[PDB]
Design a protein around this ligand. Structure first.
Ligand SMILES: Cn1c(=O)c2c(ncn2C)n(C)c1=O
Lengths: 395, 727, 394
C-alpha cells in the first residue's frame, strides 16, 4: 500500500453506433492499437520496456475479442514482448476494474508502469456471444433467479416511484450535457479519432448522440417469464412499471479506452506529468435480482476507505446504464444535480461494456482539470449484483 | 455525395433498349483498342447506371456487351502508379465509386447478363461478376481472371468480395485471387466463374436476352438477385465464426508465408486480410474494407515496382522497344540445333512446341536421340496431367528430327548452337554446317560468357552471327538474352527478336560484352553468398537470406546447379578481360571458397556433391562438413544485411551495365533480371530496385545510395554507388 | 505494506481428455465443489469478509463464459459482495489470479480474496474463443504465429536435447507423480469430485500412466509452421521434432482454489497461515519460440526478493514440454532433486486456467511436508510471456 498510483494519460475512441455504425468495419484489436499509437505520438521518447503489463477489460472475449486481446494488442502494436497483456471480465465495470487492478499492482510495488483500459465492439461481438455459465446451465439459472438488467431497472423505478416522465427527464438532460461538452471542446484532446491503414478518417465523434432530443420524442418510445420471476422474490410488489426505453437506457456502441498508470518514480524517470492520483478503490455488491443497486455500498465503502464524505467529492460520475439507477443513486446519497454526470453519459454517448469504466474515468480527469476542481468519484453498477467505485484527486 | 460519378471525358458505353425493355450496354472506348477501367469508363457507366434507375419502369433486363476483340481488361495503371501516399483518399473514392455503380447494377431488381466476347481480365471480370449470369464465347485467345496481384494490387472493384461470396474464403483465395490465375472459357465455366458457353460471339447477345426472357418467366422472385442477397445465404466453407473453418483459418497466413518464403510481397497478405475480414460483415461493409486494402497497396512502393516492371516495362518490350526500327519480317522454316545437352534439348522442345520443324544434331545418333527423349519425357508429364492431347503431343515430337550427320542441316534457316563452352570448338562446329544451311540462315550461339564478336569470326557470314542466350530449364525459363556482336546486323537482331516472341518467350537486346548482362549480374549474387560463407556466416542463414530476399532459389543451391567449373572459369576469364589494359583486377573474396570446394571434390550437382548432398540425384540437406570447413557461426551479421548484400550487389552491377552501354533500357534491365536470372518480382527489377528501395534510411534513389554507402563501410568498397546514381 | 498469506490451497483431481471422468461435469461445478470444501474446512468463517473471487480461464466461452467467477459466487450461495472476476493470461492465468490477489491484499483495499482457476478442456477445447492473433490474417502474418509444440522442438534442436533426453524427463515426471500419490502427499489437497447424489465421479489424476517405460515412450510418434519458425531462426537448418504426447503436458479438466489474505484478516477469521507470498514478477521473451518467458521472469523475481538460486529449496515449473523444463534447468543450473519434485503436467495434466494455482498449492504442501523454507513457482505462457512467484513457509 506504500506506492501511490498516478494517472498519466487517459484517452478513448469515439463511440460508434450499433446500426450502420462507422466503427462496424473496425476490428476490436485495431481500436486498441490505435490508442497505443496515439500514446506513442504523445510521448515518443518513453522507454516502452518499463511498461510491465497491459490490462484490458472485455465482457465478451470471443471471436475478434478472444485469445487474450490485451496480449494481441501488445504484439500487434510492436510493444516490447515483456509488456505482458491480460484480459479480465467483471461485466460492466471491467474498464474501471482494469484501472483499479493496474493501480493496486503499482501500490504493491511489484509493477512500475501499467496500461489499463478496455475494449468492446458490440456491433461485431454482441452482448452474450460468450455464452455463460448461468445461461447454459438451467440448474444454476433456476436457482440463482437470473433476471435481465432492464427488468431490475424498471423494478427500481417502481419501488422508488420514478415515473416515465422522471426517467425521460434524466435522459433528456444526459443528451443536453453531452452536447454541451462536445460543443465546448471538452473532449477535444481525449477523444482520439479512428483512422484506417491509409490515414483516412472513420469516426471522430460519439455518433450515438441525439442532441435534438425532445421531451415529447422520448414519450413516444416503447418500453423494452422474467417479470414473474422478479416478483417471486419481491413478493410485496404487485406490478412492475416498465418505464425504460431505448432513449433512457445506455446505448450499444463500439469503443475502446486506454489509461496509463504508474508510480511517481516511474513517471519522473520517463518525463511524464501526473494528471491525477488514485485515492481509493472499492468493490461491493447488492441483490442479484435487482442487479442494479450495486454502486451504493461500493461508493460508501470507497468514501469511508478514503476518509471522505459526499461533500468532499466535487464530481460524481455514474454510468448511465438505466435512468432509474442514476436517480436511485442520486436519491440515496443526496447528490447535487449539478455534480452528477456533468458531461452527459451512456444514454447519450453509449456504453461499450468493458471499455466504459476507463472512458468515464478519463472523462473525470479532463473535467477536474477543466474546472480546476479537486476530487471526483467514479462508479458503475454491474450485473450479478456487483459494484466498483474509485476516487481520484487532481495533481 | 453518394454518387455514381467521381469528378469532359469521351462517352464509352452505347445505349440500346429493345421493344422488350432489355437494355444492351455495349462498351466501346474510342481512345484505345481495349475497354479499360479509366476515367472515361467511370463517367460513362455512371451515366448509364443513372439512366437504368431513371427508366426503371420501362426496363426488364440488362445485357453488358463489348465491341472490341476482348471484353474488358484492366484498370488505369498510368494513374495508379502516380498515386502518392497523400492521394490515398482519392484512390479510395475511385474504387468506391466504381463499386457503387456495379452494386446498383447488381441490385437493380432485374436480371443482368454479361456477354463476354473475349478476354475479361481484372476489372473486366469484376464487371462481369456484378452480373447475375455470365455467358462466354469459347474463342481462341479468350482469358478470364483477376491478375491484380501480379501487379502488386488486388481486385478492388469487387473481385475479392464477390469471389469470396461465390466460392468461400479458401477456394476463392487459392484458386483465383492469390496468384491471379487466368482461365480459358472452358476452365472458367468449370470452376464457376462463367455460367454457360457459346460457339461464336454472334450468339452472345441473342442467348443473353433469351436467358433474361426465361429467367423472368421461370424465376420471377429470384430474378436479378444474387445468392448473397437472398436470405438464408450460407457462405461456402462457412464464415470465420463457423467452427469448421475457424479450425483451419489460422493456418492460412502461415501457409502463405511458406509459399512466399518470407519475401516482402504485401499484395497477397492484403488479399487474404480483405477476404477474411470481408466474410465477417455484410456485403457493403466487406466491399469498403476491400477498398481500404486496395488504396493501401496502390499508394505503396511494391505496387509501383511491379506496375513499372510487369506492365509498363513489359509492354514496351513486347511493343518492340529494343527491336531495330524499319526491319520487316522473315519466316523461319527449319530450325537446326547443334548439341543435344539439356540446353539444346530444351531449345528443340520449345521450338517444336511453337510449331517449328527442328533438326537436332549431335556428335552421335545415340546422343541426339537422348536429347529428343527430353521432349518425350516432358510430353509424358503433359499427357499424364491432361494438359495436351495425344494428337498434338505426337505432332510436336514428330517435328524433332535427331541426327548425327551435318548433311541433315539442309534447308535450315535458323541455326542455334548449344555445344560446350569453348571458342575453337564453336568455331569448328559452325564451320561444318555454315555451308550446308541456307545462305540467309541465322547463326545463333548459346554461349554464356564468351564474347559474340570473337565467335563470329569463325563464320564467313558474320553479319548473320548473333548470340541467342537461353536459361535452363529452357522449357520453363521465359527470357532469351539476345547479344549483338560488332558485326551483327540489325536484321539478324529483329529475326531473333521475332523468333523469341514466336516461341512464347520475352527478349532483351544486349550489346557484346564479356559476361553479357545475365551471367555477369548473377555472378555478383552468387559471389556475395560464397563470400559470406568464407566470412564465417552459417550456411542456413545464407540460404534463408536468399529465400527471404525473394529469389526463387537460394544462392548456395544455385551454386551447385551452375557448377563451380563454369563459375571458376569466369573468374580467370574476367580477370584477363581487363588484365591487359593496365587495369588491376581485384580478386573477389569468393574465389578462395570456389577453389577450396573444388579442392575437396565438391563442385556441384553434376559431380553429385557440392554445398548440399545429393542422394541418387535428389538434394538432401546442406553438406554437414561445411560448418567445420569455413568455421560457420563465427560471423553473425544481421539477416537484413545479408539480404541487402545480395540485392545491392546485383543492383549496382546492373547500373554498371547501363553505364557501359551493355543495356539500352531500364525495361530490359528489369525484365531481364526478373525473367532471366530470377531477381525478385517485388523489386520490380534490378534497376527499379534503386529508385524503389525502402528501408530505415527512407525510400528512393537517395535512400539506396545511403544504404549502399552503409554496406560499403561494413563489407567492402564494391558496394560504393557509381557516379551515375549521385546528384 | 500489508503482507499476503496463503491460508488454503486445494484442487480437483485432473480428468483425462478421452473418456474422462470429469467430462460430464460442468466447469462451474468443479469450482463450486472446492468452495463447498473450503466451507467444510472453516464453517465459522464469515464469508462477508471475502471481498473478491479471481479465477483464471483461458477459454472463457460456453460453459466457461459469462464471468464464471461471478457464477461460482452466486451458485455457491456466497455473499453477493464477494465480487467475482475472470482473467486470461493464457497458461499463467491460475498463478496470475493468485498474484493479483496478493497484490490486492498488499494495497490494503482488499482483506480476504479467493483465487484460482478453472479449465474444462474436454468441454471447452482451447481455441474455442477464437482470437485476433489466429483469426485475423493481417496481424497473424506479422506476429509470426507458431504453435508452441514447434517452439519446444526448436528449443530441443538448439539446446541439443535428444529424443531420449526429453523422454527421460517424461519418465521421471511419471515416477515422481506416482510416488507422490503413493506417499499420501496429495491426500489433503486433492478434493474428489462427486455428483448431486454424493456418488463418486473422480478421486485421482486419470492422465497418469505410472507404468511408463523408456521403451514405451520411444514407440510414440511426434500449415507451413515449420518454415515460419525457421524464417526467424534462420541459422537452424532443420527442426528435430522430439515432442510426443508422452513428453508433453496432458489435456485435462480441473480446477483449483487458493485463499489469500492479510495477517489481520486471517487472525480475525481464526485461520492459520501456511505460506507467505514473498514476491511476484512478470517478464517475456520471443513469441515465435513461445517458451522462453520463464527464465527472465524467474531471474526478476529472484532479484526483486534479494535471493539467488541457492536460497530456493524447491523449483516448480509447469511441464508444458519436456525441453522447456530442461532448458530452464540448464540456464539457471537448477539441481535435479529440487525441480518438480512431485511430478508435473506430463504425468498429471495441464488444465490451462487452473494449472498455476494447482502447482502453487503443490509447493505449499511440499514445503510443509519437507519442512522447507522457500519455493519458486513459474509457468511458460503462449505469446511469449512468463510469470514467477516465490513463497516462504510459515
Ligand atoms: C548461430 N547463431 C546463433 O546461435 C544465434 C543467433 N542469434 C541468436 N543466437 C543464439 N544467430 C544470428 C546465429 O547465427
Amino acid at each position: 500500500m506504500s506506492e501511490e498510483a498516478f494517472i498519466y494519460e487517459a484517452i478513448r475512441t469515439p463511440r460508434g453506433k450499433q446500426k450502420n455504425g462507422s466503427l462496424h468495419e473496425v476490428k476490436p484489436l485495431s481500436l486498441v492499437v490505435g490508442l497505443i499509437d496515439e500514446l506513442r505520438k504523445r510521448h515518443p521518447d518513453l522507454d516502452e520496456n518499463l511498461i510491465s503489463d497491459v490490462i484490458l477489460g472485455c465482457v465478451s472475449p470471443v471471436g475478434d475479442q478472444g485469445g487474450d486481446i490485451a496480449r494481441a494488442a501488445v504484439l500487434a502494436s510492436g510493444m516490447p514482448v515483456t509488456s505482458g497483456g491480460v484480459q479480465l471480465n467483471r461485466f460492466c465495470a471491467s474498464g474501471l476494474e482494469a484501472v483499479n487492478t493496474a493501480a493496486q499492482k503499482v501500490r504493491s510495488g511489484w509493477d512500475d508502469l501499467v496500461l489499463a483500459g478496455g475494449v468492446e465492439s458490440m456491433s461485431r461481438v454482441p452482448m452474450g456471444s460468450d455464452g455463460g455459465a448461468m445461461g447454459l446451465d438451467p440448474a444454476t439459472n433456476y436457482d440463482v433467479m437470473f433476471v435481465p438488467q432492464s427488468i431490475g431497472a424498471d423494478l427500481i423505478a417502481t419501488i422508488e416511484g420514478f415515473s416515465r416522465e422522471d426517467v425521460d427527464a434524466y435522459a433528456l438532460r444526459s443528451q443536453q450535457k453531452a452536447a454541451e461538452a462536445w460543443s465546448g471542446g471538452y473532449f477535444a484532446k481525449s477523444v482520439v479519432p479512428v483512422r484506417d491503414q491509409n490515414g483516412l478518417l472513420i469516426l471522430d465523434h460519439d455518433e450515438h448522440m441525439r442532441p435534438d432530443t425532445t421531451k415529447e420524442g422520448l414519450a413516444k418510445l416503447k418500453p423494452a417469464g422474467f417479470d414473474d420471476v422478479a416478483l417471486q422474490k419481491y413478493h410485496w410488489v404487485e406490478k412492475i412499471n416498465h418505464v425504460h426505453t431505448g432513449g433512457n437506457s445506455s446505448g450499444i456502441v463500439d469503443g475502446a479506452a486506454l489509461v496509463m498508470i504508474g508510480s511517481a518514480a516511474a513517471g519522473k524517470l520517463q518525463g511524464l506529468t501526473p494528471r491525477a492520483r488514485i485515492v481509493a478503490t472499492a468493490t461491493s455488491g447488492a441483490d442479484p435480482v435487482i442487479m442494479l443497486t450495486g454502486p451504493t455500498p461500493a461508493t460508501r465503502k470507497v468514501l469511508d476507505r478514503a476518509g471522505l464524505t459526499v461533500d468532499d467529492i466535487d464530481l460524481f460520475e455514474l454510468n448511465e446504464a438505466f435512468a432509474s439507477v442514476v436517480l436511485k443513486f442520486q436519491k440515496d446519497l443526496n447528490i447535487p444535480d449539478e455534480k452528477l454526470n456533468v458531461n452527459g453519459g451512456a444514454i447519450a454517448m453509449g456504453h461499450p461494456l468493458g471499455a466504459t469504466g476507463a472512458m468515464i474515468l478519463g472523462t473525470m480527469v479532463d473535467e477536474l482539470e477543466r474546472r480546476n476542481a479537486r476530487r471526483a468519484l467514479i462508479t458503475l453498477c454491474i450485473g450479478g449484483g456487483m459494484g466498483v467505485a474509485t476516487i481520484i484527486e487532481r495533481v | 455525395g453518394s454518387s455514381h460519378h467521381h469528378h469532359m471525358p469521351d462517352n464509352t458505353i452505347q445505349w440500346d433498349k429493345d421493344a422488350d425493355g432489355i437494355v444492351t450496354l455495349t462498351m466501346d472506348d474510342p481512345s484505345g483498342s481495349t475497354n479499360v477501367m479509366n476515367e472515361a469508363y467511370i463517367e460513362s457507366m455512371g451515366k448509364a447506371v443513372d439512366r437504368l434507375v431513371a427508366e426503371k419502369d420501362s426496363i426488364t433486363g440488362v445485357v453488358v456487351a463489348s465491341a472490341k476483340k476482348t471484353f474488358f481488361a484492366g484498370g488505369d495503371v498510368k494513374t495508379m502508379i502516380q498515386a502518392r501516399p497523400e492521394d490515398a483518399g482519392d484512390v479510395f473514392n475511385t474504387v468506391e465509386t466504381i463499386k457503387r455503380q456495379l452494386r446498383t447494377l447488381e441490385t437493380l431488381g432485374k436480371p443482368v447478363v454479361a456477354a463476354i466476347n473475349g478476354a475479361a481480365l481484372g476489372g473486366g471480370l469484376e464487371i462481369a461478376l456484378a452480373c447475375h449470369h455470365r455467358i462466354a464465347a469459347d474463342v481462341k485467345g479468350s482469358q478470364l481472371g483477376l491478375p491484380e496481384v501480379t501487379l502488386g494490387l488486388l481486385p478492388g472493384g469487387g473481385g475479392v468480395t464477390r469471389t469470396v461470396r461465390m466460392f468461400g474464403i479458401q477456394n476463392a483465395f487459392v484458386s483465383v485471387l492469390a496468384q491471379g490465375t487466368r482461365f480459358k472459357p472452358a476452365k472458367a465455366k468449370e470452376i464457376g466463374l462463367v455460367d454457360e458457353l457459346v460457339a461464336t460471339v454472334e450468339e452472345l447477345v441473342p442467348a443473353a436476352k433469351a436467358w433474361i426472357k426465361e429467367e423472368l418467366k421461370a424465376n420471377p422472385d429470384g430474378a436479378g438477385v444474387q445468392p448473397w442477397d437472398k436470405k438464408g445465404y450460407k457462405m461456402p466453407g462457412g464464415t470465420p465464426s463457423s467452427p469448421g473453418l475457424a479450425a483451419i483459418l489460422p493456418s492460412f497466413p502461415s501457409n502463405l508465408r511458406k509459399q512466399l518464403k518470407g519475401a516482402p510481397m504485401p499484395a497477397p497478405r492484403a488479399i487474404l486480410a480483405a477476404a477474411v475480414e470481408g466474410a465477417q460483415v455484410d456485403f457493403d461493409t466487406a466491399s469498403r474494407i476491400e477498398s481500404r486494402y486496395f488504396a493501401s497497396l496502390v499508394t505503396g512502393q511494391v505496387a509501383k515496382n511491379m506496375m513499372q516492371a510487369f506492365f509498363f516495362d513489359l509492354q514496351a518490350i513486347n511493343a518492340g522497344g529494343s527491336r531495330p526500327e524499319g526491319i520487316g519480317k522473315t519466316p523461319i522454316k527449319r530450325i537446326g540445333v547443334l548439341g543435344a545437352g539439356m540446353m539444346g534439348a530444351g531449345i528443340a522442345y520449345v521450338s517444336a512446341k511453337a510449331g517449328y520443324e527442328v533438326v537436332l544434331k549431335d556428335v552421335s545418333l545415340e546422343a541426339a536421340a537422348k536429347g529428343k527423349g527430353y521432349s518425350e519425357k516432358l510430353e509424358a508429364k503433359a499427357l499424364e496431367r491432361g494438359r495436351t492431347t495425344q494428337e498434338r503431343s505426337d505432332a510436336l515430337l514428330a517435328r524433332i528430327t535427331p541426327t548425327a550427320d551435318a548433311a541433315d542441316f539442309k534447308g535450315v534457316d535458323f541455326v542455334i548452337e548449344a555445344v560446350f563452352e569453348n571458342q575453337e570448338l564453336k568455331h569448328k562446329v559452325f564451320g561444318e554446317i555454315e555451308d550446308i544451311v541456307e545462305p540467309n540462315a541465322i547463326l545463333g550461339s548459346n554461349t554464356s560468357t564468351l564474347p559474340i564478336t570473337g565467335l563470329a569470326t569463325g563464320v564467313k557470314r558474320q553479319e548473320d552471327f548473333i548470340g541467342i542466350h537461353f536459361f535452363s530449364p529452357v522449357d520453363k525459363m521465359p527470357l532469351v538474352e539476345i547479344i549483338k556482336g560488332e558485326k551483327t546486323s540489325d536484321e539478324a537482331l529483329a529475326r531473333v527478336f521475332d523468333y523469341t516472341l514466336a516461341i512464347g518467350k520475352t527478349p532483351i537486346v544486349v550489346n557484346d560484352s564479356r559476361g553479357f548482362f545475365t551471367s555477369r549480374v548473377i555472378g555478383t549474387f552468387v559471389n556475395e553468398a560464397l563470400a559470406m560463407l568464407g566470412e564465417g556466416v552459417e550456411p542456413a542463414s545464407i540460404e534463408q537470406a536468399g529465400s527471404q530476399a525473394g529469389y526463387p532459389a537460394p544462392p548456395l543451391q544455385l551454386s551447385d546447379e551452375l557448377n563451380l567449373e563454369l563459375m571458376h572459369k569466369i573468374a580467370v576469364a574476367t580477370r584477363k578481360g581487363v588484365e591487359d589494359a593496365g587495369g588491376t583486377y581485384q580478386p573477389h573474396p569468393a574465389e578462395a571458397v570456389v577453389e577450396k570446394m573444388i579442392e575437396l571434390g565438391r563442385s556441384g550437382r553434376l559431380k553429385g556433391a557440392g554445398f548440399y548432398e545429393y542422394a541418387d540425384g535428389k538434394r538432401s540437406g546442406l553438406w554437414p562438413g561445411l560448418r567445420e570447413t569455413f568455421k560457420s557461426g563465427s560471423s553473425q551479421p544481421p539477416l537484413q544485411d545479408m539480404i541487402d548484400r545480395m540485392l545491392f550487389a546485383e543492383a549496382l552491377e546492373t547500373q554498371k551495365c547501363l553505364d557501359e552501354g551493355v543495356l539500352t533500357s531500364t525495361a530490359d534491365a528489369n525484365i531481364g533480371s526478373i525473367m532471366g536470372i530470377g531477381f525478385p518480382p517485388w523489386t520490380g527489377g534490378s534497376a527499379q530496385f534503386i529508385v524503389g528501395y525502402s528501408g530505415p534510411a527512407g525510400t528512393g534513389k537517395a535512400a539506396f545510395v545511403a544504404r549502399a554507402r552503409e554496406l560499403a563501410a561494413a563489407y567492402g568498397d564494391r558496394f560504393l554507388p557509381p557516379e551515375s546514381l549521385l546528384s
